[PDB]
Amino acid sequence: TQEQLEDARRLKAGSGKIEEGKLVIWINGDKGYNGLAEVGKKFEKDTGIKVTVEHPDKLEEKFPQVAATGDGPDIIFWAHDRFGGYAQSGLLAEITPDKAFQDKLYPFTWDAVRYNGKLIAYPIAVEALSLIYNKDLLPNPPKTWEEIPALDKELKAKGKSALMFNLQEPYFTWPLIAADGGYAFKYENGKYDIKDVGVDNAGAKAGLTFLVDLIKNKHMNADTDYSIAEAAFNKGETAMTINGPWAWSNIDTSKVNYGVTVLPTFKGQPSKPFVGVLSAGINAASPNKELAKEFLENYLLTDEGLEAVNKDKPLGAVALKSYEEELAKDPRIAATMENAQKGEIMPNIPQMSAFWYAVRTAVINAASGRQTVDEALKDAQTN
Ligand SMILES: OC[C@H]1O[C@H](O[C@H]2[C@H](O)[C@@H](O)[C@@H](O)O[C@@H]2CO)[C@H](O)[C@@H](O)[C@@H]1O
Hints:
The chain is an alpha/beta fold. It contains 17 helices and 15 strands. The PDB classes it as dna binding protein.
């Protein structure tokens, strides 16, 4: 091995290398990490406790690797779906808010961070993809996926395109795949059936086939990723994109007169985005669990704390009732919640990591022509 060898060092160098008396926080690079750092500076100014916010690449993969050895950040930020796996591996602490604090957040946000009956993270905000469109190029967005080919033909004649979004992450293609019947794991009798995966059915096939056909007919490019799509939309080159609340800040900066709205239907069915709750978990190896709790409950999850993050990159519909009442006025938030209602909240089971990896490969291989749609989804279904 070169993992059982550090089983020997971790005791000799006993025990744990997370620095006591400060907080290290990891959050994804597309989120308001500068705004979160402002909340951390307020904490430091009040309490003397230094807070360092980091946004490493692939943190959702690095965290279980480093936390398994007792290293990593004190606090990890990510959508709730990854947290059941972390908790199953013993990497997350059970969190302990009194009832007065729990009443400050929406009951459904607490449910996303409950694993085997216990709370394993603090919920921050509800994320759902919406259709984002350029009102100057497209005063009225398409109601259906099916009319997008004809729209692209029209826009292509003008050196524009209809739609670009990140084809590299299955998160972004899922709303179309799920629209006519795709699902991850079938939930029944109080639990997810890990042997009942729904990525190989007729509905999932129809959705992915529609996407592949878009690419075959030159209405999309298989290599489009997050940065390519964001640049194209914000430069005014494409009429539509698909993204979450965090993206609105850069569009504000851009020249673009944009709207946020319901995703198009497919075969008459609503697109069904998987809904994420951005959540903050506490590293089980952290010597700073009480510090982490004080920071999360009394500094971040306040009107002032969430505002600071939100002003950097919008959080979506926040879990904190008092602040959401102010944000609910925003039509972009209304659209987010409309898409969220039509979708469904992600599972947090340990199998989600394998699921996302399977679907990622399936979409990329089908989109690039390395596999047929049937072949790709059959593979993703198995196991
Ligand atoms: O694409 C698979 C990916 O989907 C979700 O990741 C989202 C995340 O929830 C959003 O907050 C935002 O950062 O975009 C990500 C997609 O690039 C799942 O949460 C994640 O576990 C999964 O791998």
